[PDB]
Symmetry: none
Subunit: 309 residues, 4 copies
Amino acid sequence: KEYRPTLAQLRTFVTIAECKHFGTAATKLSISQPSLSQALVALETGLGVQLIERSTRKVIVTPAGEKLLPFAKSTLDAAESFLSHAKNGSLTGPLTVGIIPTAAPYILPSMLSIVDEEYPDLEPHIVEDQTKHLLALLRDGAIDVAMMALPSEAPGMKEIPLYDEDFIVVTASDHPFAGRQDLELSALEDLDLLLLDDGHCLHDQIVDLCRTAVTRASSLTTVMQLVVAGLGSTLVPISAIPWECTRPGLATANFNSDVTANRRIGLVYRSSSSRAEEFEQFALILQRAFQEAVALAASTGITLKQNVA
Amino acid sequence: GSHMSNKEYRPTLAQLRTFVTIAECKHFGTAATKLSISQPSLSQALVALETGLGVQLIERSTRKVIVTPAGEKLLPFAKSTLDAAESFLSHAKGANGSLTGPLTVGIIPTAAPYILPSMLSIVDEEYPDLEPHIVEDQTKHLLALLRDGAIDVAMMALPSEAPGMKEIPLYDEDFIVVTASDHPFAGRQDLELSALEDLDLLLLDDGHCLHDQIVDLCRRGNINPISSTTAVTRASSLTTVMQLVVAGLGSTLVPISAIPWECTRPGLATANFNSDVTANRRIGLVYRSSSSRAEEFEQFALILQRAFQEAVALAASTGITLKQNV
Amino acid sequence: GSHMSNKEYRPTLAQLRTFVTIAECKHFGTAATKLSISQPSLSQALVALETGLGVQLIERSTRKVIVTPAGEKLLPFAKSTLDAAESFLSHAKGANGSLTGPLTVGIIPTAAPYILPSMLSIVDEEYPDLEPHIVEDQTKHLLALLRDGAIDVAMMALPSEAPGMKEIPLYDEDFIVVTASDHPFAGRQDLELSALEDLDLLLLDDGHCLHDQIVDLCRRGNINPISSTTAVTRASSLTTVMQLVVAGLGSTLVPISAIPWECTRPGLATANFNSDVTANRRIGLVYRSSSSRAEEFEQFALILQRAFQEAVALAASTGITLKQNV
Amino acid sequence: KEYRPTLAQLRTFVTIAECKHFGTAATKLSISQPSLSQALVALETGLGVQLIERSTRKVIVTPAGEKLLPFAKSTLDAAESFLSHAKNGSLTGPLTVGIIPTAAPYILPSMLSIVDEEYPDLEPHIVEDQTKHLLALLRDGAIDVAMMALPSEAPGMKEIPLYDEDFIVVTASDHPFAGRQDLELSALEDLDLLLLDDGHCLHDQIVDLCRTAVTRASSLTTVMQLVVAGLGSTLVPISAIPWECTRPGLATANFNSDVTANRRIGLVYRSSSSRAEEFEQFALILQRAFQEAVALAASTGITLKQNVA
Ligand code: NA
Ligand code: NA
Ligand code: NI
Ligand code: NI
């Protein structure tokens, strides 16, 4: 035959060999004495090896059996180990998170601190990269969830909204809009805007736009350099204010209440995942992290955008 | 949720084999073909496993399979369960007794001397109809001979990276550090990879694999990341190196099987890397994939494993302190 | 011997060019063709050099040329002599003034912010008819744009390993180590490669090349030998990394040009590797080999070199201690 | 033109720029004042740049010249550096030596010690490998010289003989030839010889031969293992006696005076090399190293082969 032993057969062998009685062994395995015998005989017939000698009062392991016993035992130990590691509505184990570059720096320390202090069994793994790369990794299973601007517009993905994050206007210190808090969308025409692909959504009740020597930057650092040097102005998410907007050479302004200038940040994951509940719990952490970043921005004394509604 | 872990459930080997195959193939079609079962029954077995455990192991899309993080964590445990079962079966063919006739074995020079007496003794006593022929030579020569049929099997460091071959893993063999008696690291048992800078290591092409959790000096991408800073650019023999170590012109790494023969003479001391450092080699048996003698070679592998275990106990019996691992 | 060194002899650049070409080509035929001279006159020039010096540089066989050990030792010195002469000529075309019209430049994110203001200032003041267009993005994007003609030149870490490109080397840029204020290595200026184990380095794909005389962690054979032991598997931005460093969750490497902008805020300290450690990157200009604008690009390279020199002086003026090299 | 400046032209420029007079400059360069002028004008015409202004009493470097001066100066410094590093019937600088595996271990420490103490400017580099590999490296210039058994029989190579090295017979302790010093070549038929490809040459006046489970070994260690275990006997070069033949489980024997059992060790190098004199000087070191190894062998108290002639 092309016989392969089963774990139940191996369990019968190991138990008999250690108990040295059929009665004791069958009771320890919660099976009948005929079934115990059947499984042993199936094993000995499959192998072509007598493992156990049976007498009236006692059982003896053959020399062939003593040689094979440690190997059967390691097989059962590994199976028990598999089961033990396979062991409930909570954030535990590995969680691999993609985060876009214009969000990551400003919330990552809060998020990691909260996980370390309050979710001690969670094992977070963070990948920071551009939206398109994050979605490719998500699709291929190299990350579990991606924190990014919504809508994702990615097939087969589900979205959990986290928060709306306002932008602030950042100019050179000497720019005539320095300190203004009532700008209209028309004010855009008077700035040499260098914008990043950061999910910004700009509109008011009439105009919808939610649709320099440097053609395009991928980093806010390149942009801020140009702004300090007087060659441009830009939009910065408010979470980045403490880190990016407090150095000399910069000033800030804001649009009026009637202008929307924000981005919708969300968690995106594969529809095929069973982990929706874990991701929702993780969302709560990210919302807190953002609120901590917002309070840090407010504590700089820089005036933040005011909104209606 | 109310569809979590099933208490009386125990996974079967067939269920574990379905899991491992899907996880490695990443398609249901190629997995079912490899297991010679239907695509519905593959699915049935996997769902039985996932329902028993209360854990999603695989995510299913139209074109694609993805192993979940829970699945990746459990994959090595399923694999060890199957490996132990295959090991049991392999040792149960001690009755089969297929090791007869001529067997020509290539063995690398930093392994052969230290396991050859055990292996030949075991063959002579327990496999009296086996007719062993041993060729001891450098890796490249052994592979040319293997390729051309002049040897049947080669015992060497894995990966072999040889076209047309199969590999049977035998064992991981640690190295010990060997210095001159006067070297400042003599006697240390907690050396880190940084110790390389002050060891003056003269290394052989002996399969050594050195790394810790942060730095990898192994992955031999056709360029050796450890350089020598000594008058000896390149040594091909351990005896040349040990002579240089006794003379105070460097230190080296020696396989633990070689300790009784090489590391007990005057002028030498030994040291070891710490638990967190890997400093070992993967020894394997390599043969031509077309061979009808796979089962004989697997039986021969078991003999080599015993021979190595005997060499390790001989090393231990010298009283020299060996590498500890986690 | 009585056919040793000639006292009044001075080597000429043409003689040195004959030597370097033969040494690299290893045939007289391909060397003479590359220099557009006859095979006899190539030989004549080499023999004039060897007779002047009293040193055999090349051994001649029928099929083969071999550079002598004396020759291998002198080869980098001949090469630096020719490079300096080419540099002189390249700077003498400051009068030529070929940098006009549109020039679209790709620059990697860990270089662009720190040299962009200098470069644009120099262009605006001294090359008023040049019309620069800057694209700042990750290496792979820049190379796709370069390949497709959407940019003319890319400023990036060498080697580029991009098909169809030429490279102009610009400069080697050292890194500085950046830690949290409380890190035990804060302030050190003598760190060895072993310090990696206790730094918790979060590294970017920024061209960093780390090695000393014994260990090479650079040679990126499509597999990163330094691993991270942190919650952050992979960061693509320096700002993410610096935030993590301030928060005490790791250390990093920062190009020295970025010191004024990135390394002067509270919560950070700096350190450096010792003289014997290399921790730098080779920055170069990469362009399509078919281009008729090679001379314009070489002139643009000189501007970038000045911009970098200005960024290094800005870094120096902060009072932060920079890496020393041998 | 496709003009390239010459070093002489650059030297004229740098000298004038530093001296600030044509007379002083021409004298410092040991050339005529017309020749100095000619070289400068050739440089300025080739470049299309005036580097020097000439007045009656004085010379002034133009702004274009001041900019170019450091580059000319580095060109001349590099040329002077080349010449300085290019600088006599002695063993100095790099010497890359191939040595066969059955010779290397037993002479390498003496040789390196002698070089380090007595030839402080020599920079030795040692490659130890099999004869065929050494010859491939020699041919390709990756080594300068190979220490090996003669004849090499390699095309285009020259040989320097170093010494004849005797072999000793090594058996298991219990072998009936233990301690014998008068063996004939016929004694070979009574040993299960495992021999290495080590250049051994065996003959007497009548028979010329100079022409186990282990089919073949490349290492003496594999062979000695088999000899201690009683499965073979072998031949060992006398230089290896202290290291290889003093452990328990071994005994030694020798052939009689009328038997030759030796190997001719030599240095082999490419005919195309000009370094014969250096190699001859290196040969003297190797001869001493071998004589030290021979005295070490003798000091073990093991009886060495006696020869006629
Ligand atoms: Na994990
Ligand atoms: Na050298
Ligand atoms: Ni991309
Ligand atoms: Ni070979």
